[PDB]
RNA sequence: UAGUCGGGUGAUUAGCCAGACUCUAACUUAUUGAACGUAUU
DNA sequence: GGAAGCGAAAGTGTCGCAACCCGAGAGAGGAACGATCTCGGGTTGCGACACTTTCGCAACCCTTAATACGTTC
């Protein structure tokens, strides 16, 4: 109508998809839709910066598990939780990883259903209206400020139904499915790892049907909580035989075996008729994947395989480099780790489960984003559960930069117990969970100490509740209490005073911080009392 | 099946006749009915039920008509959802009853 | 026996009384339209 | 007819298990090596079940109705 075609040319997304799905000026609007989703500029820095940003902006949870009302605020780029209650933590992204399901289902299919509440384990137990409610909103430029997602679940037996609100979602999905469909666009990427991601790894890996190279794979099981680290070693394989492959020398291999079947049917053996026919059709089956392949405007097998080594590379701090080796007649991706060469399963723990972290984000952002220069400059929501399992303090310094570089436009929320972590985050990024002994809480709130730049021990105090020396050691006590004796006489070394000091002496070293802190109070009382005399 | 949806859930959907095996195979016209009428005392005496399939492939689609059972249900759901009352049982005891036993499996599902 | 029909009574959609019926076997429905009854004209 | 959300019905794919095979290795009897048993890695078939797809319940009442009271469709 006339309001929907002064809404789009406003830039309302919705107004110009909907002119465009009753005209099929279906031209104006197609390319309208399509410039909203792909257009973009480099900053000053050189990363590629979509005009239209998506990201979660507000979550809040209604009578759902142990929460009687829970509101959160997320930041776009960056959003930590901390606390000790571990196990409400790990329900907030539940929350989120089920409504995220939502525009997976829909981007793959038309009518994709999401994940649904549990009557079972998602409804508070004392629930007054037996019924739970997630609601989120999501944001997507300034020409859809705010996409409203509900999901809901009632107990049985209640008077009224409470169903889930999910047709914003779906209306948004609908938009990314079916303009990709007509014109290829960059994709979002959705992902989970809960510490479930440590696991160890089959070195037995499977013969590749072709599922991996199809790019919708990207959002297979990707809300799962693992990854799946195992298809990206089985994709990895498979862009290496194809790199030292050509492409169509198969099509032009098979086009010669067409032409010599030919042959031999005009020659007058109409028995091979059949045969012929088989191999006109793997014939047209290669040219159609090959012209698929032209048409969906993928990169190059040659540029993805090297776009994912030098992510590896870049985040994961001791491999230097990963390649695909021909051994036994037998297939082995091999790594430089600290300087030498070792198989994946002689990796570490901690460096295992980091790679397949990382491995497994940039094989789904080059799959999803084929257009950018740099595919991980890609859009998407990423939820990382504990964070930093199985790093060495070194490695947590490290790990926040290391992947906001490497990924600079996904949303991460993330989970972690770690002061040295939140020694490199903002604190308007923090958010604490401090719940009552009921396990509910209303709002979560930002520490009031800034954390990024600030020493360990500072966050270990005032924003863990964590005593710089551990309590339950005599010695960890001994300084303070030579300063309590030392200021119960004048400030002289009595009797008592100095048998403390040589036991400090004698347990810390000549050497240590604890002794020198005791000189320096030696020296100042002893300066204090000088001018104390001077004074009388 | 559709009286027990609807105590448990406003709207909830009951069962559905076989498209596969339901129809029957000599039948010109290519759609089944089962229609019954139930009986709640003489304030209702009367509560009919139609549920319907077309065979597969079949371009007409003949429709179910369940409003009936639903409105029923809602009674019982509502006034019991304000005040206790004893509900009606439904069951059914089918061949399938012979099973082996398991102590060892045990249902986590509700 | 049960179910059904219904003459009467009953501050009356109940209850009670009387009489009757029985193909395997009623489940009381829908307007502003149409038709029918009543009113108005 | 059939919105939007939901779940029944039916078909397909995944995946973890158990059974089995194989070569390696320590080393019984007393000099001649290697008997017997177990480790550890791999392959295969099976079946329970997670995932996928399709159908179908029935909102709304289209700009567009009349208004004395009843009954029927
Ligand atoms: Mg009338």
Redesign the pocket.
Same mark, same amino acid.
């Given at each position: 109508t006339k309001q929907y075609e002064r809404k789009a040319k406003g830039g309302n997304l919705l107004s110009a998809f909907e002119l465009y799905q009753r005209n099929s000026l279906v031209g104006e609007w197609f390319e309208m839709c399509r410039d909203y989703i792909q257009d973009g500029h480099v900053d000053e820095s050189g990363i590629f910066r979509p005009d239209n940003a998506f990201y979660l902006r507000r979550l809040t949870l209604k009578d759902f598990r142990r929460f009687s009302l829970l509101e959160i605020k997320l930041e776009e780029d960056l959003t930590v939780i901390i606390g000790n209650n571990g196990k409400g933590k790990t329900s907030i992204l539940y929350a989120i990883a089920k409504t995220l399901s939502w525009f997976v289902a829909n981007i793959?299919?038309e009518?994709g259903?999401g994940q +649904?509440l549990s009557e079972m384990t998602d409804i508070k137990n004392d629930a007054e209206d037996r019924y739970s409610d997630v609601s989120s909103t999501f944001f997507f430029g300034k020409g859809l400020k705010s996409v409203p997602i509900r999901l809901?679940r009632s107990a049985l037996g209640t008077a009224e139904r409470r169903?889930?609100?999910?047709?914003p979602a779906?209306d948004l999905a609908d938009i990314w499915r079916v303009i990709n469909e007509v014109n290829t666009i960059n994709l979002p990427t959705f992902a989970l790892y809960n510490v479930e991601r440590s696991q160890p790894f089959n +070195?037995?890996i499977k013969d590749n049907?072709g599922?991996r190279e199809e790019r919708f794979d990207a959002y297979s099981?990707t809300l799962?909580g693992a990854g799946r680290f195992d298809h990206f070693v089985e994709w990895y394989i498979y862009l290496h035989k194809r790199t030292v492959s050509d492409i169509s020398s198969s099509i032009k291999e098979l086009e010669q075996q067409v032409n010599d079947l030919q042959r031999t049917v005009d020659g007058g053996m109409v028995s091979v008729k059949s045969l012929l026919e088989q191999m006109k059709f793997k014939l047209s089956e290669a040219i159609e994947r090959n012209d698929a392949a032209v048409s969906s405007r993928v990169l190059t097998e040659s540029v993805q395989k090297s776009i994912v080594e030098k992510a590896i590379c870049s985040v994961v701090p001791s491999i230097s480099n990963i390649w695909v080796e021909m051994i036994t007649g037998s297939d082995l991706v091999k790594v430089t780790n600290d300087g030498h060469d070792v198989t994946i399963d002689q990796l570490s723990d901690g460096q295992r489960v980091f790679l397949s972290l990382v491995a497994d984000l940039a094989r789904r952002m080059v799959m999803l984003n084929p257009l950018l220069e740099n595919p991980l400059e890609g859009r998407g929501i990423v939820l990382i559960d504990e964070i930093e399992l199985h790093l060495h303090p070194k490695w947590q310094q490290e790990v926040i930069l290391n992947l906001r570089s490497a990924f600079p436009n996904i949303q991460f929320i993330i989970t972690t117990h770690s002061p040295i972590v939140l020694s490199t985050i903002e604190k308007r990024c923090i958010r604490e969970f401090e719940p009552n002994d009921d396990g509910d809480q209303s709002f979560l709130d930002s520490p009031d100490m800034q954390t990024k730049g600030s020493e360990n021990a500072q966050i270990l105090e005032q924003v863990m509740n964590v005593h710089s020396t551990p309590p339950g050691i005599a010695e960890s006590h001994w300084l303070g209490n030579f300063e309590l004796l030392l200021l119960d006489n004048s400030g002289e070394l009595d009797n008592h005073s100095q048998v403390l000091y040589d036991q400090i002496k004698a347990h810390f070293g000549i050497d240590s911080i604890e002794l020198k802190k005791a000189d320096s109070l030696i020296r100042i009382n002893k300066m204090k009392n000088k001018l104390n005399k001077i004074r009388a």
């Open positions: 793959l299919k009518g259903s +649904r809901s169903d889930s609100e999910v047709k779906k +070195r037995n049907t599922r099981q799962g």
